Design an enzyme around this catalytic site. Sequence first.
Site, mmCIF file in Angstrom:
data_model
loop_
_atom_site.group_PDB
_atom_site.id
_atom_site.type_symbol
_atom_site.label_atom_id
_atom_site.label_comp_id
_atom_site.label_asym_id
_atom_site.label_seq_id
_atom_site.Cartn_x
_atom_site.Cartn_y
_atom_site.Cartn_z
ATOM 1 N N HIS A 62 45.047 26.382 42.292
ATOM 2 C CA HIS A 62 45.991 27.514 42.835
ATOM 3 C C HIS A 62 46.036 28.682 41.763
ATOM 4 O O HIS A 62 46.615 29.841 42.176
ATOM 5 C CB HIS A 62 47.305 26.951 43.078
ATOM 6 C CG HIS A 62 48.058 26.220 42.051
ATOM 7 N ND1 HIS A 62 48.766 26.603 41.059
ATOM 8 C CD2 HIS A 62 48.097 24.775 41.898
ATOM 9 C CE1 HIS A 62 49.256 25.689 40.430
ATOM 10 N NE2 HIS A 62 48.824 24.564 40.888
ATOM 11 N N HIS A 92 49.327 31.919 33.129
ATOM 12 C CA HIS A 92 48.433 32.136 34.282
ATOM 13 C C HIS A 92 48.644 33.413 34.721
ATOM 14 O O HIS A 92 49.700 34.030 34.483
ATOM 15 C CB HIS A 92 48.617 30.991 35.152
ATOM 16 C CG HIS A 92 50.001 30.798 35.510
ATOM 17 N ND1 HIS A 92 51.004 30.024 34.900
ATOM 18 C CD2 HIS A 92 50.907 31.243 36.758
ATOM 19 C CE1 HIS A 92 52.268 30.074 35.508
ATOM 20 N NE2 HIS A 92 51.904 30.968 36.681
ATOM 21 N N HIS A 94 49.008 35.535 39.066
ATOM 22 C CA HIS A 94 48.984 35.616 40.565
ATOM 23 C C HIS A 94 48.368 37.098 40.750
ATOM 24 O O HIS A 94 48.771 38.020 40.045
ATOM 25 C CB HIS A 94 50.442 35.606 40.793
ATOM 26 C CG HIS A 94 51.245 34.381 40.424
ATOM 27 N ND1 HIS A 94 51.191 33.114 41.275
ATOM 28 C CD2 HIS A 94 51.473 34.069 39.364
ATOM 29 C CE1 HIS A 94 51.764 32.239 40.521
ATOM 30 N NE2 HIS A 94 52.171 32.655 39.459
ATOM 31 N N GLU A 104 54.338 38.830 42.016
ATOM 32 C CA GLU A 104 55.333 38.024 42.665
ATOM 33 C C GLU A 104 56.711 38.868 42.794
ATOM 34 O O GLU A 104 57.261 39.150 43.578
ATOM 35 C CB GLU A 104 55.669 36.525 42.033
ATOM 36 C CG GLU A 104 54.057 35.827 42.248
ATOM 37 C CD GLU A 104 54.370 34.341 42.049
ATOM 38 O OE1 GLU A 104 54.785 34.141 40.911
ATOM 39 O OE2 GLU A 104 53.976 33.781 42.902
ATOM 40 N N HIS A 117 52.212 35.240 33.800
ATOM 41 C CA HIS A 117 53.169 34.426 33.511
ATOM 42 C C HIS A 117 53.141 33.533 32.207
ATOM 43 O O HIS A 117 51.930 32.987 32.253
ATOM 44 C CB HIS A 117 53.559 33.459 34.671
ATOM 45 C CG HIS A 117 54.150 33.895 35.723
ATOM 46 N ND1 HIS A 117 54.410 33.639 37.065
ATOM 47 C CD2 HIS A 117 54.750 35.446 35.952
ATOM 48 C CE1 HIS A 117 54.733 34.596 38.017
ATOM 49 N NE2 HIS A 117 55.045 35.442 37.229
ATOM 50 N N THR A 196 57.860 29.641 40.762
ATOM 51 C CA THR A 196 57.387 30.073 41.822
ATOM 52 C C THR A 196 56.271 29.381 42.439
ATOM 53 O O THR A 196 55.834 29.579 43.660
ATOM 54 C CB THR A 196 56.842 31.544 41.603
ATOM 55 O OG1 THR A 196 55.579 31.373 40.943
ATOM 56 C CG2 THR A 196 57.950 32.408 41.037
ATOM 57 N N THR A 197 55.958 28.053 42.059
ATOM 58 C CA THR A 197 55.112 26.996 42.771
ATOM 59 C C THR A 197 55.637 25.729 42.827
ATOM 60 O O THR A 197 56.647 25.585 42.087
ATOM 61 C CB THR A 197 53.922 26.717 42.141
ATOM 62 O OG1 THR A 197 53.729 26.440 40.942
ATOM 63 C CG2 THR A 197 52.847 28.048 42.105
HETATM 64 ZN ZN ZN Z 1 53.384 31.860 37.917
#
Ligand code: ZN
Length: 258
Positions: A62, A92, A94, A104, A117, A196-197
């Site tokens: 992901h 990581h 997004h 996000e 992040h 957020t995951t």
């Molecule tokens: Zn994240």
Amino acid sequence: HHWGYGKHNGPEHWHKDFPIAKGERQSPVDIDTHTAKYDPSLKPLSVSYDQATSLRILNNGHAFNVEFDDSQDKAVLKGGPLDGTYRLIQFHFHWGSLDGQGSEHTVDKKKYAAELHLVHWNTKYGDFGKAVQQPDGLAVLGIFLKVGSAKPGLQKVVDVLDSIKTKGKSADFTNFDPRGLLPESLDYWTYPGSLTTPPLLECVTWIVLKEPISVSSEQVLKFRKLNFNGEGEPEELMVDNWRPAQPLKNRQIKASFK
Ligand SMILES: [Zn+2]
């Protein structure tokens, strides 16, 4: 089947396996700059990354994570709204399928091309797995990316992505210095939130930097060449791996600056 970002397993479905998704301190949120409260008692952030030891880069299906040695206080965050010392474990990103989306968090409903992040855990809980079970267990530093000039400190990451194109692939990734990803100013907003995951645990003090970093169109395009799928499976490009903004509910966003 398992959670992801597609039409049948995306964020609007996560609550069926992870009820917390509909909890009271979920992330991300939209940052309304005019109702955020300046808090003069917030201290400056203290980022000590000079001894950071990166180990590996991994495609986990992901996102891709750059992982760090967190067995000692080598890369730590302190100050700001935090009590105690938080160790860097991984970072990581997004990102979107287009330059107009990908972050996000949003700022007055504005979306950025990507969001970085940097994930840290409170050393008083001994390890990352214990920390995620605590309301003050994690501190995540969030940095917006806008498309503009290239960021030289990011290119080492960009160049290795072809080695980890599919889910489960990893590669040695030593001597990477995260200081090269920080903006000039460390002014921030902060609020209590969640991962957020999945598992979406409500254990995060979010620290979102006001100043974005700029990356080139060529650098972000290489993010979009990664794959959600494993090798030998049908190709699904890793894009739009972001969760939409969640209701603020009974929370105040504070700002370190006026
Ligand atoms: Zn994240």
